[PDB]
Amino acid sequence: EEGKLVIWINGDKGYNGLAEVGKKFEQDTGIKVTVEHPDKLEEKFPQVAATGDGPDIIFWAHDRFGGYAQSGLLAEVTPDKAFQDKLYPFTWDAVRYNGKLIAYPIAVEALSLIYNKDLVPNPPKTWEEIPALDKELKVKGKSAIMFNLQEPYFTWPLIAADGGYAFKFENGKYDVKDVGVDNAGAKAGLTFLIDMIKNKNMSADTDYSIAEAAFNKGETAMTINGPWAWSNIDKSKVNYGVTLLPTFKGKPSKPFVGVLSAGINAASPNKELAKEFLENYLLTDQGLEAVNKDKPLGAVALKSFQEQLAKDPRIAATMDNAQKGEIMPNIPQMSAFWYAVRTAVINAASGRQTVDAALKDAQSRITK
Amino acid sequence: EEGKLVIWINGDKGYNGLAEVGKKFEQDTGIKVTVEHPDKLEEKFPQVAATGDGPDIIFWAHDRFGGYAQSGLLAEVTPDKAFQDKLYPFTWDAVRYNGKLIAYPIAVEALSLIYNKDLVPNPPKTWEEIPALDKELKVKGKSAIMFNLQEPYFTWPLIAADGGYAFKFENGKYDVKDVGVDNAGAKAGLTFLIDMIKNKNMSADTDYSIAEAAFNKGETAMTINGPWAWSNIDKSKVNYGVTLLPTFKGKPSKPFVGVLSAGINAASPNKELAKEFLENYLLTDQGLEAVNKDKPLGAVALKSFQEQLAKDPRIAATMDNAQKGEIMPNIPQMSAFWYAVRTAVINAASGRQTVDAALKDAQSRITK
Ligand SMILES: OC[C@H]1O[C@H](O[C@H]2[C@H](O)[C@@H](O)[C@@H](O[C@H]3[C@H](O)[C@@H](O)[C@@H](O[C@H]4[C@H](O)[C@@H](O)[C@@H](O[C@H]5[C@H](O)[C@@H](O)[C@@H](O)O[C@@H]5CO)O[C@@H]4CO)O[C@@H]3CO)O[C@@H]2CO)[C@H](O)[C@@H](O)[C@@H]1O
């Protein structure tokens, strides 16, 4: 039924308090909210939603929602980034399935030991001591502990303690044996660069200083650079804009995204001072501003200062290109990648190798 | 040298502005900060830090830091959770290596197209149109574009556009063929439960209602339950505390962590209204409070309301147990896990099966 909301929530939750939220909703909008707590709602939902019925909103712990999403029974949820930042990131992770958010997280639950302060002022720290405690309580006509033995949720914490688990999780990883430096897409893009060189649209010996000087003197119409370069263009005569990289074969250019980072030397005798400087001086609105006014940093990691920068169209363009690209890996094999690709590009642009032979050699260097 | 800070940062960054931050540091603390920008600092650092020298702090894009961390050259950084929440989560991800944070993220960089508004008011959207643009500019003694061709950072966005990549990333995944329901640790914990039953410390037919009534009437000293149960104990005569689950064989009990979640039915004709209710009524301080006063939610996903709850020792204990446990998977196979483990526990506790035969059968159900 359109124009109202039906909600299902389990009978052990605060469904009367939720109903009070629904009354405020109606009072503000006229839309009636009905809260129900059917038994076995988590089993009924897939059966009724598959026929296009059921409630508008279903509450359960997240463990049930991947099965619902796999069957197409859930709408993708569409919160903007402002709303997403209101909730803890790990709670969104709990409701992501196949890369999409498929629920709103509400609350984080875990079992605890609940004890009667007047019967056991000092509750047992070990399971093994509970039988002796029970013996003393049984002479008083009491028992040490009772909990639900019918639902495995309640017995699982004991089963997992010494090593039981449900499914093993394999952390995300880069496959270092698998590299895309000599595939057809890489060759196509490098061939286009070499064809511009052959056509004398560019020169293979152009380096950072040559390109910067040419652009900042008004000799070339465009350049490719990062935020650190903007300060020198500000001081030049050139009125410049910052925008998306050109597309190739209709697809976006994909710049590697770098996070400028400050590491503390493991040999440093000043680790406490380094922490203080970085946390309490550099990573402040005022600290980042002092660096940024020298040479722009780009988008910054500090949420409070980034909010002040996001307005700048140069920063907007930086983040647009960043979102089309990829974060760099931090793995040790990244330097091998860069050394090999550097040689391949210089060899191909200078005619020391074909594009194919250059990128094949780079691929062999990186993976063998 | 102890009692001062030496910083290395690349020569294209704002090292004079960083030096100004270091002057404010000295003025406040008397500790001198020296900022250097050596050439090839990213290659020199591993050579000098391996001998126990080098700078206290090194700046570079994060791609270099996994190699440093792999060689033991970086201190693990130790920000508390308050500081971590000041920076964007994906920037911390960039400086995590083998599960540890090994740098402070500062700024997010990507290349952009920089254009001269007075030479190309409408900059080209495609690479392919740049040669024709260059031809017209060359008759004016100008060129269309110049950028650094010596460093692969600048040519990679074009190489990646049609399909080039560095290393393929494999997303984290649960291995559904690999289940820990019948390993030695699971059997040990379930055997201890069965031994308590045999010893008449517990009864195999105890369910949720029986245990709740017994605890809330003062007949048993302890129970195991979640936040939703606290409201009924508040109303009872019992003075209760909430604490860590007991250990087993010296290891923590590991409760599964559930995120109470609200999904929107894909068949709902009211998806816009559902979004409004959940985002703007339920997921507010006032909305969660109305539910929480009925039956406590536990820790909540909404950062602003959770800050008000974290003070409660019951919530502290909830999160302590949660951190010792595991987040539930959301995969479709989770319901099979629960149905099979439910049968195993009830069969073993009732004597319908041995612990070994029960858990073996559950393992077979879940994985075949
Ligand atoms: O007729 C035979 C049988 O019926 C009855 O048992 C059945 C249940 O009525 C029925 O709900 C179903 O239970 C399944 C459930 O469908 C399944 O999802 C899974 O449940 C998990 C939760 O998914 C998980 O979130 C967690 O639940 C917590 C919850 O997070 C928390 O917020 C609070 O609500 O406590 C919950 C635990 O009670 O863990 C549970 C697992 O414990 O597994 C359930 C099975 O255990 O199927 C039941 C069996 O058919 C009768 O009770 C039974 O006597 C009859 O034999």
Ligand SMILES: OC[C@H]1O[C@H](O[C@H]2[C@H](O)[C@@H](O)[C@@H](O[C@H]3[C@H](O)[C@@H](O)[C@@H](O[C@H]4[C@H](O)[C@@H](O)[C@@H](O[C@H]5[C@H](O)[C@@H](O)[C@@H](O)O[C@@H]5CO)O[C@@H]4CO)O[C@@H]3CO)O[C@@H]2CO)[C@H](O)[C@@H](O)[C@@H]1O
């Ligand atoms: O003597 C032979 C050779 O010497 C010179 O080239 C060498 C360089 O001096 C040297 O620095 C080294 O360069 C490597 C570098 O060590 C390696 O880490 C990798 O560099 C990556 C960055 O790691 C990555 O962050 C990104 O760098 C951006 C950076 O994020 C950004 O903030 C800004 O600073 O621009 C940087 C790009 O310039 O990408 C670079 C890769 O481009 O790979 C480098 C190699 O390309 O080794 C050089 C070669 O030995 C001379 O220049 C050369 O002519 C001589 O032949």
